[PDB]
Design an enzyme around this catalytic site. Structure first.
Site, PDB file in Angstrom:
ATOM      1  N   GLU A 216       0.768  -1.234   0.000  1.00 31.20           N
ATOM      2  CA  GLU A 216       0.000   0.000   0.000  1.00 31.20           C
ATOM      3  C   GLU A 216       0.813   1.305   0.000  1.00 31.20           C
ATOM      4  O   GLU A 216       0.263   2.361  -0.282  1.00 31.20           O
ATOM      5  CB  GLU A 216      -0.869  -0.044   1.274  1.00 31.20           C
ATOM      6  CG  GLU A 216      -1.843  -1.221   1.313  1.00 31.20           C
ATOM      7  CD  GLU A 216      -3.050  -0.917   0.493  1.00 31.20           C
ATOM      8  OE1 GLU A 216      -2.998   0.299  -0.028  1.00 31.20           O
ATOM      9  OE2 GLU A 216      -3.887  -1.735   0.229  1.00 31.20           O
TER      10      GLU A 216
ATOM     11  N   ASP B 161      -6.347   7.246  -4.837  1.00 32.97           N
ATOM     12  CA  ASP B 161      -6.220   5.849  -5.029  1.00 32.97           C
ATOM     13  C   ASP B 161      -6.147   5.429  -6.477  1.00 32.97           C
ATOM     14  O   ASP B 161      -6.340   6.220  -7.416  1.00 32.97           O
ATOM     15  CB  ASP B 161      -7.200   5.107  -4.093  1.00 32.97           C
ATOM     16  CG  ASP B 161      -8.250   4.171  -4.639  1.00 32.97           C
ATOM     17  OD1 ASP B 161      -8.655   4.441  -5.857  1.00 32.97           O
ATOM     18  OD2 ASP B 161      -8.767   3.327  -3.934  1.00 32.97           O
TER      19      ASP B 161
END
Ligand SMILES: [Cl-]
Ligand SMILES: [Cl-]
Length: 162
Positions: free
Chosen positions: A11, A20
């Site tokens: 991540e 994102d």
């Protein structure tokens, strides 16, 4: 190799609101802030999560606090979930870590929908689960991360991440 290092690898760490891979506002270590298009809605959410007037920026300590919360919630959602818990219960440690990864990444709901692979995992048909897992939007959206998580389940080793 642990679930924390594993996810931190997958991540990244970002101290400033960002977007994102699908369009969403995120921060820290994979923490989804909002799915709405308002950056404003997003500092408000962040504001709220942290407990202070953010600015759209958090410390590393703050980011880790969120992360700790999210790994927790993940583990607890799995154990609560009737469809998920038996899969988890049947797996070894390495493979459990990867299941956790899959839920952090996508929601308890999300994967409680991954019906056939769930049943393949449970039946310890590794190779077949791996092939079925790759036939997903998830895979097609973030192929390098997804491959790492799938190999961990297929193999039961931490190879994809050394
Ligand atoms: Cl939160
Ligand atoms: Cl990736």
């Amino acid at each position: 190799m642990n679930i924390f290092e594993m996810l931190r690898i997958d991540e990244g760490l970002r101290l400033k609101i960002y977007k994102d891979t699908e369009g969403y506002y995120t921060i820290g270590i994979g923490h989804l802030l909002t799915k709405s298009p308002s950056l404003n809605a997003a500092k408000s959410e962040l504001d709220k999560a942290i407990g202070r007037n953010t600015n759209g920026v958090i410390t590393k300590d703050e980011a880790e606090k969120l992360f700790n919360q999210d790994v927790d919630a993940a583990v607890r959602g799995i154990l609560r979930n009737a469809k998920l818990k038996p899969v988890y219960d049947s797996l070894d440690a390495v493979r459990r870590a990867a299941f956790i990864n899959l839920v952090f990444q996508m929601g308890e709901t999300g994967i409680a929908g991954f019906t056939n692979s769930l049943r393949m995992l449970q039946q310890k048909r590794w190779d077949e689960a791996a092939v079925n897992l790759a036939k997903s939007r998830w895979y097609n959206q973030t192929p390098n991360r997804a491959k790492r998580v799938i190999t961990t389940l297929r193999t039961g080793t931490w190879d994809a991440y050394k």
